Design an enzyme around this catalytic site. Structure first.
Site, mmCIF file in Angstrom:
data_model
loop_
_atom_site.group_PDB
_atom_site.id
_atom_site.type_symbol
_atom_site.label_atom_id
_atom_site.label_comp_id
_atom_site.label_asym_id
_atom_site.label_seq_id
_atom_site.Cartn_x
_atom_site.Cartn_y
_atom_site.Cartn_z
ATOM 1 N N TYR B 38 -24.718 0.121 38.185
ATOM 2 C CA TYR B 38 -25.045 -0.382 39.503
ATOM 3 C C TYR B 38 -26.523 -0.150 39.781
ATOM 4 C CZ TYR B 38 -23.776 -2.183 44.088
ATOM 5 O OH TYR B 38 -23.675 -2.984 45.208
ATOM 6 N N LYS B 93 0.633 -16.540 33.192
ATOM 7 C CA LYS B 93 -0.167 -17.414 32.358
ATOM 8 C C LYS B 93 -1.466 -16.682 31.972
ATOM 9 C CE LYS B 93 -1.203 -21.373 30.517
ATOM 10 N NZ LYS B 93 -0.271 -22.120 29.661
ATOM 11 N N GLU B 135 -3.325 -25.542 36.193
ATOM 12 C CA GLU B 135 -1.923 -25.340 35.877
ATOM 13 C C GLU B 135 -1.060 -25.620 37.087
ATOM 14 O OE1 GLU B 135 -0.670 -23.911 32.758
ATOM 15 O OE2 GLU B 135 1.329 -24.341 33.557
ATOM 16 N N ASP B 136 0.091 -26.229 36.836
ATOM 17 C CA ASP B 136 1.067 -26.530 37.879
ATOM 18 C C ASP B 136 0.573 -27.251 39.128
ATOM 19 O OD1 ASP B 136 2.286 -25.084 35.949
ATOM 20 O OD2 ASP B 136 3.322 -23.723 37.347
ATOM 21 N N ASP B 161 -0.746 -28.054 31.208
ATOM 22 C CA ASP B 161 0.556 -28.701 31.360
ATOM 23 C C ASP B 161 0.682 -30.083 30.699
ATOM 24 O OD1 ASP B 161 2.529 -26.976 32.758
ATOM 25 O OD2 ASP B 161 1.066 -26.919 34.373
ATOM 26 N N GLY B 195 5.236 -40.515 31.013
ATOM 27 C CA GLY B 195 4.555 -39.626 31.942
ATOM 28 C C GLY B 195 3.337 -38.888 31.402
ATOM 29 N N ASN B 285 13.836 -29.497 28.638
ATOM 30 C CA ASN B 285 14.524 -28.239 28.824
ATOM 31 C C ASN B 285 14.784 -28.009 30.307
ATOM 32 O OD1 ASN B 285 12.848 -25.798 30.022
ATOM 33 N ND2 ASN B 285 11.405 -27.023 28.789
HETATM 34 MG MG LIG Z 1 -25.246 -5.656 48.717
HETATM 35 MG MG LIG Z 2 3.088 -25.096 34.019
#
Ligand SMILES: [Mg+2]
Ligand SMILES: [Mg+2]
Lengths: 383, 380
Positions: B38, B93, B135-136, B161, B195, B285
């Site tokens: 830092y 995921k 995703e999704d 996907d 699709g 599935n």
């Molecule tokens: Mg600051």
């Molecule tokens: Mg998915």
């Protein structure tokens, strides 16, 4: 002699490719493990939440993860250097969140300086997190973004580069009160800063107890009976109730201490005319309102700054960890003003026998205590 | 099968409160350690990057962190359930990225559905990551979402996907083409499902060197001389070149390959009507288009599904971890088809001269063998 920096451990970035890492805290090495953590089983974790969105706090990382967000416009003591250049600081900040408190913090930098779409970006992220910590974004955009975010968000938003040191300064006086034998309702407090920051500290002070506070800006004392002050009308009403119509210099006059925000605006000579044991908090970045040593020979009893070389450094660190840990633990839909003072007392509690040591170091308890106070300070159930 | 006790026999989510956590890769615990990670040491890192942006890939976690982003609108099989409920799926995921490949991943859900809002959100946060995995998010918006991102982002944007599963099936047929010893140019391929996934399959086959692919959908064979669209590049003009339009049945006639996406149909009587040595990839599935059992009975050369239940399970986990591991190790600005095909070629090679075990499992460095193939394939 032959100086460099030493802290040129820039090789520490190169070697590890950043400083943060994401570790699963669940089993995931097998087909059996993945049927639980993902694809098949996971569908039912989603389902429970779809019926009861509150469950998000029990079944997702929203429970312990905060986002550290910036636009790279006000990174440290540098400048608007962009989001990528800011990342080292935001992830450093996030490593503290985890090391000092048990907070999971994700550093996030966006390249957009448009206020409107920044508040709109975060609002869209809100679902993901349990807390938002705005960092290093430049003023005045840094004040509107926070207010619109605090109001429009369902989770606590805290702009650290502002209320942060404020909370530590507030703790630094609680301890300052003690070794002077005075109360917070007997103290004459002068705040230099008409901006929103100086104003916040002021609201906090009054809320903390403080009876008499006189605010000062670039053109003199904020006096209520002098309709010659900006449309920011309200502070006039609750501060400077003797109505001294003069200047900063004419304010130290028997003042028990000053909290500030402007570069070298406090010339030693004046200190002489302050109250008996004059405390001083020159919070101005780089070049403070007056160097600690340069103000001790004048007659000050206590001096604090935001600089590591001098004694009594008022640093953010003692506050942001505990406050979110406490807020997260309570599932607070926002961080209140009483919650922030709560943090200040907690911080205060960590100093046994003070002198020249009024602000606690980084011990074991020091985030727990703070979080302890933040929670329980919520002793105001709307029911 | 109520056997899905896992769904309950999990709730580790409650025990662990989420599945992920953030951990530092460097020292803290002493003031001096903090001095470097830092202020004021970190100031040299920021400044250095400020003067050379390509260092962001070197000194910040951007070098290895990809974000798994969704709007909780098409979460695994549950539809539009909102961001909070999508979070569990994105956490899983993300975990997989770290588990299989070295990739650090952060789950991020969004409270909006307006396409323009989403695209601009990702643009705002890319800086922070080296890769984005959509995703999704449901169609037809995901289409405009990914396509715009791919060509408007400096870091690779991918929608696992619609292409992931597509990539592995490809991996599977490259290998099946060996036992068959036929050219991906000679095979007659039928794809059931017009699709998202359906198309991604065809589009990859036609780039991998397929000359005979015909797609079938809700109404039958897609026929270029019959089809009509609301924009009119399109699948129609690159398939069914015989211009033979009929049923999904009156089309598997002596076809050597079938890839099915989301139904449960495909009758055992049809196999023999296909080519001499047909291959069946039943990807739907939980219920496949046809169980491996019957398929083999009915006289099918090779069969693979999306089931760990039977042999040749074609599953995602083989593709995305490695394609991102490599599209990051090589710092790429986009995830192309070349890279995807290369991903699958890598996959297939994880099986040294096969049998009716056309695909690999999850040994050691699977994600690397694939990363190694994707990277060094963009080096051109
Ligand atoms: Mg600051
Ligand atoms: Mg998915």
């Amino acid at each position: 002699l032959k100086n460099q920096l030493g802290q040129l451990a820039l090789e520490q970035a190169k070697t590890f490719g950043g400083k943060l890492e994401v570790q699963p805290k669940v089993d995931i090495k097998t087909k059996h493990d993945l049927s639980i953590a993902y694809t098949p089983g996971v569908a039912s974790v989603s389902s429970a939440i779809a019926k009861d969105k509150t469950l998000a706090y029990d079944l997702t990382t929203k429970k312990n993860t905060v986002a550290v967000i910036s636009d790279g416009t006000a990174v440290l003591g540098l400048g608007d250097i962009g989001p990528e250049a800011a990342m080292p600081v935001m992830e450093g900040k996030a490593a503290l969140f985890k090391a000092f408190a048990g907070v999971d913090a994700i550093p996030i930098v966006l390249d957009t300086k448009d206020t409107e779409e920044i508040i709109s970006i975060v609002k869209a992220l809100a679902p993901t997190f349990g807390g938002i910590n705005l960092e290093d974004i430049s003023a005045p955009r840094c004040f509107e973004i926070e207010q619109r975010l605090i109001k429009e968000c369902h989770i606590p938003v805290f702009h650290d580069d502002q209320h942060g040191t404020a909370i530590v300064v507030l703790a630094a006086i609680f301890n300052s009160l003690k070794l002077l034998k005075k109360s917070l309702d007997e103290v004459s407090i002068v705040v230099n800063g008409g901006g929103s920051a100086g104003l916040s500290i002021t609201r906090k002070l009054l809320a903390a107890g403080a009876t008499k506070v006189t605010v000062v800006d670039k053109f003199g004392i904020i006096n209520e009976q002098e309709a010659a002050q900006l449309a920011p009308d309200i502070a006039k009403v609750t501060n400077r109730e003797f109505k001294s119509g003069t200047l900063e210099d004419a304010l130290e006059g028997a003042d028990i201490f000053i909290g500030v925000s402007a570069p070298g605006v406090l010339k030693a000579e004046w200190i002489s005319k302050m109250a008996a044991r004059p405390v001083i908090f020159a919070m101005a970045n780089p070049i403070p309102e007056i160097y600690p040593d340069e103000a001790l020979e004048a007659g000050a009893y206590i001096v604090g700054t935001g600089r590591s070389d001098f004694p009594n450094q008022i640093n953010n660190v003692l506050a942001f960890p505990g406050i979110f840990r406490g807020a997260l633990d309570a599932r607070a839909k926002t961080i209140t003003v009483e919650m922030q003072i709560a943090a200040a007392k907690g911080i205060a509690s960590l100093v046994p026998d003070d002198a020249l040591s009024t602000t606690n170091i980084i011990p074991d308890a020091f985030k727990e205590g703070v979080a302890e106070i933040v929670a329980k300070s919520v002793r105001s159930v709307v029911l």
